[PDB]
mmCIF file of C-alpha atoms in Angstrom:
data_model
loop_
_atom_site.group_PDB
_atom_site.id
_atom_site.type_symbol
_atom_site.label_atom_id
_atom_site.label_comp_id
_atom_site.label_asym_id
_atom_site.label_seq_id
_atom_site.Cartn_x
_atom_site.Cartn_y
_atom_site.Cartn_z
ATOM 1 C CA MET T 1 85.078 187.490 132.554
ATOM 2 C CA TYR T 2 82.111 186.571 133.030
ATOM 3 C CA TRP T 3 80.139 184.650 135.728
ATOM 4 C CA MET T 4 80.420 181.548 137.899
ATOM 5 C CA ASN T 5 78.155 179.910 140.463
ATOM 6 C CA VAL T 6 78.761 179.456 144.237
ATOM 7 C CA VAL T 7 76.259 176.917 145.617
ATOM 8 C CA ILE T 8 75.818 176.809 149.400
ATOM 9 C CA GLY T 9 74.566 173.306 150.288
ATOM 10 C CA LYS T 10 71.147 172.360 151.615
ATOM 11 C CA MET T 11 71.489 169.639 154.227
ATOM 12 C CA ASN T 12 69.417 167.875 156.900
ATOM 13 C CA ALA T 13 70.208 167.423 160.579
ATOM 14 C CA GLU T 14 68.625 166.427 163.825
ATOM 15 C CA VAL T 15 68.496 168.333 167.096
ATOM 16 C CA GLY T 16 71.881 167.870 168.820
ATOM 17 C CA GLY T 17 73.396 166.230 165.679
ATOM 18 C CA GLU T 18 76.156 167.343 163.337
ATOM 19 C CA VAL T 19 75.915 168.283 159.756
ATOM 20 C CA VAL T 20 78.516 169.076 157.069
ATOM 21 C CA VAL T 21 77.552 171.636 154.444
ATOM 22 C CA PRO T 22 79.542 171.863 151.242
ATOM 23 C CA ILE T 23 80.264 175.091 149.433
ATOM 24 C CA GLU T 24 80.469 174.272 145.688
ATOM 25 C CA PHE T 25 81.833 176.125 142.695
ATOM 26 C CA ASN T 26 80.463 175.498 139.161
ATOM 27 C CA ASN T 27 80.771 177.116 135.764
ATOM 28 C CA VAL T 28 84.313 178.069 136.701
ATOM 29 C CA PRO T 29 85.680 180.121 133.780
ATOM 30 C CA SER T 30 88.078 178.257 131.469
ATOM 31 C CA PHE T 31 90.970 180.562 132.578
ATOM 32 C CA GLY T 32 90.479 179.599 136.232
ATOM 33 C CA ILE T 33 90.350 181.461 139.500
ATOM 34 C CA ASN T 34 93.364 183.162 140.987
ATOM 35 C CA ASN T 35 91.592 184.543 144.040
ATOM 36 C CA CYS T 36 88.284 184.928 145.771
ATOM 37 C CA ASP T 37 86.955 186.235 149.071
ATOM 38 C CA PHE T 38 83.433 186.197 150.464
ATOM 39 C CA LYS T 39 81.559 185.868 153.680
ATOM 40 C CA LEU T 40 78.613 183.645 154.660
ATOM 41 C CA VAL T 41 76.060 184.040 157.390
ATOM 42 C CA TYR T 42 74.518 181.328 159.535
ATOM 43 C CA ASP T 43 72.141 181.307 162.569
ATOM 44 C CA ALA T 44 74.497 181.163 165.564
ATOM 45 C CA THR T 45 71.502 180.979 168.017
ATOM 46 C CA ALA T 46 70.559 177.690 166.357
ATOM 47 C CA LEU T 47 73.931 176.274 165.153
ATOM 48 C CA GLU T 48 77.371 175.830 166.682
ATOM 49 C CA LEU T 49 80.107 176.123 164.130
ATOM 50 C CA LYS T 50 82.749 173.392 164.677
ATOM 51 C CA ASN T 51 85.094 173.718 161.737
ATOM 52 C CA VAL T 52 85.870 174.668 158.170
ATOM 53 C CA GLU T 53 87.911 172.480 155.786
ATOM 54 C CA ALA T 54 89.263 173.334 152.338
ATOM 55 C CA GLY T 55 87.694 171.409 149.461
ATOM 56 C CA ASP T 56 89.556 169.206 146.967
ATOM 57 C CA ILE T 57 89.326 171.840 144.117
ATOM 58 C CA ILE T 58 91.959 173.866 146.099
ATOM 59 C CA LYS T 59 95.490 172.767 145.399
ATOM 60 C CA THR T 60 97.929 173.378 148.334
ATOM 61 C CA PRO T 61 95.264 174.746 150.725
ATOM 62 C CA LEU T 62 97.726 175.477 153.601
ATOM 63 C CA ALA T 63 99.408 178.067 151.365
ATOM 64 C CA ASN T 64 96.372 179.279 149.415
ATOM 65 C CA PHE T 65 93.183 178.894 151.544
ATOM 66 C CA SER T 66 92.085 180.448 154.839
ATOM 67 C CA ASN T 67 88.931 181.095 156.791
ATOM 68 C CA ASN T 68 88.025 183.340 159.701
ATOM 69 C CA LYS T 69 85.358 182.190 162.053
ATOM 70 C CA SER T 70 85.888 184.924 164.712
ATOM 71 C CA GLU T 71 82.751 186.926 163.956
ATOM 72 C CA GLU T 72 80.072 184.802 165.487
ATOM 73 C CA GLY T 73 77.310 184.111 162.942
ATOM 74 C CA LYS T 74 79.625 184.781 159.918
ATOM 75 C CA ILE T 75 82.387 182.920 158.167
ATOM 76 C CA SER T 76 84.914 184.597 155.914
ATOM 77 C CA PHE T 77 86.635 182.580 153.170
ATOM 78 C CA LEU T 78 89.860 183.502 151.358
ATOM 79 C CA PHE T 79 91.530 181.825 148.420
ATOM 80 C CA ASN T 80 94.606 183.300 146.740
ATOM 81 C CA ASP T 81 97.116 181.351 144.644
ATOM 82 C CA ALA T 82 100.450 182.216 146.253
ATOM 83 C CA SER T 83 102.440 180.900 143.248
ATOM 84 C CA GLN T 84 100.502 183.388 141.025
ATOM 85 C CA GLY T 85 99.735 180.851 138.356
ATOM 86 C CA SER T 86 100.692 177.347 139.385
ATOM 87 C CA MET T 87 97.684 176.623 141.618
ATOM 88 C CA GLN T 88 94.560 178.309 140.233
ATOM 89 C CA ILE T 89 91.232 176.739 140.821
ATOM 90 C CA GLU T 90 90.701 175.177 137.400
ATOM 91 C CA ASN T 91 87.436 173.338 137.662
ATOM 92 C CA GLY T 92 84.279 173.163 139.683
ATOM 93 C CA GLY T 93 83.693 170.908 142.607
ATOM 94 C CA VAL T 94 83.863 171.407 146.413
ATOM 95 C CA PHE T 95 85.514 174.672 147.522
ATOM 96 C CA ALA T 96 85.020 174.098 151.306
ATOM 97 C CA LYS T 97 83.105 171.949 153.831
ATOM 98 C CA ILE T 98 81.540 173.509 156.930
ATOM 99 C CA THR T 99 80.734 171.398 159.973
ATOM 100 C CA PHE T 100 78.039 172.550 162.384
ATOM 101 C CA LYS T 101 76.349 171.006 165.442
ATOM 102 C CA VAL T 102 72.647 171.663 165.795
ATOM 103 C CA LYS T 103 72.315 172.957 169.349
ATOM 104 C CA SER T 104 70.237 170.869 171.728
ATOM 105 C CA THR T 105 67.877 173.799 172.243
ATOM 106 C CA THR T 106 67.092 174.398 168.485
ATOM 107 C CA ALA T 107 63.512 174.069 167.184
ATOM 108 C CA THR T 108 62.677 171.889 164.151
ATOM 109 C CA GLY T 109 62.552 174.113 161.092
ATOM 110 C CA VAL T 110 64.817 175.578 158.378
ATOM 111 C CA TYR T 111 67.937 177.672 159.108
ATOM 112 C CA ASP T 112 69.235 179.476 156.031
ATOM 113 C CA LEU T 113 72.907 179.816 155.094
ATOM 114 C CA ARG T 114 73.419 182.848 152.870
ATOM 115 C CA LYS T 115 75.850 184.922 150.954
ATOM 116 C CA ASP T 116 76.862 187.960 153.027
ATOM 117 C CA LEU T 117 79.619 190.301 151.764
ATOM 118 C CA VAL T 118 81.263 189.349 148.427
ATOM 119 C CA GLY T 119 84.755 190.625 147.723
ATOM 120 C CA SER T 120 86.788 190.169 144.625
ATOM 121 C CA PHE T 121 86.644 186.962 142.383
ATOM 122 C CA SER T 122 89.393 187.041 139.730
ATOM 123 C CA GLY T 123 91.420 184.894 137.381
ATOM 124 C CA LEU T 124 94.392 185.205 134.978
ATOM 125 C CA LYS T 125 93.053 184.927 131.413
ATOM 126 C CA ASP T 126 96.441 185.153 129.499
ATOM 127 C CA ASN T 127 98.208 186.557 132.529
ATOM 128 C CA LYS T 128 95.785 189.530 132.624
ATOM 129 C CA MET T 129 93.800 189.808 135.963
ATOM 130 C CA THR T 130 90.190 189.247 134.970
ATOM 131 C CA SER T 131 87.147 189.888 137.233
ATOM 132 C CA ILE T 132 84.509 187.200 137.572
ATOM 133 C CA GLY T 133 80.949 187.660 138.870
ATOM 134 C CA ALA T 134 80.038 185.254 141.570
ATOM 135 C CA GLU T 135 76.361 184.112 141.316
ATOM 136 C CA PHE T 136 75.347 182.728 144.731
ATOM 137 C CA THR T 137 72.773 180.074 145.434
ATOM 138 C CA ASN T 138 71.928 180.135 149.185
ATOM 139 C CA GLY T 139 71.606 176.975 151.213
ATOM 140 C CA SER T 140 70.265 175.838 154.515
ATOM 141 C CA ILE T 141 70.213 173.287 157.360
ATOM 142 C CA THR T 142 66.823 171.705 157.866
ATOM 143 C CA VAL T 143 66.382 170.462 161.400
ATOM 144 C CA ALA T 144 63.905 167.597 161.590
ATOM 145 C CA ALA T 145 62.541 165.433 164.419
ATOM 146 C CA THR T 146 64.214 161.999 164.735
ATOM 147 C CA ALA T 147 61.881 158.981 164.280
ATOM 148 C CA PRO T 148 62.190 156.928 167.389
ATOM 149 C CA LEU T 149 64.486 153.889 167.007
ATOM 150 C CA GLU T 150 62.085 151.630 168.976
ATOM 151 C CA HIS T 151 58.719 150.694 167.395
ATOM 152 C CA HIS T 152 55.926 148.183 167.878
ATOM 153 C CA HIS T 153 53.465 146.461 165.505
ATOM 154 C CA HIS T 154 50.248 147.413 167.373
#
């Protein structure tokens, strides 16, 4: 075992603007990760999800990574090393990048992005399937008013 950290990014955005939030892994166990699934929740009244991209800690993401954005307000992530050993997640870094657009109607304020349902996190210690606790640190998009571009020394 024992425990690793999933950090959901805290980022700033403007009304109508876009924003990319990273999902980071740290304290990845020395034996690596063979698979993990979890869901996040976002404020769909406030934010329009555009896309989800695999991070650079994932080797061969077309074979090993997927996401499911079909439940509005939620995103489901799935990593599983097809090769069963050759493409574990072996160190921390960026697991995925989520792009949102702040809707034109959204108030200034803070919109949390949280751990929802956590499934299994596991790795192969010496080819024995070993469970790993995933410690989540929730994130957010802070929507702030844009300073105007034009100003005058008066």
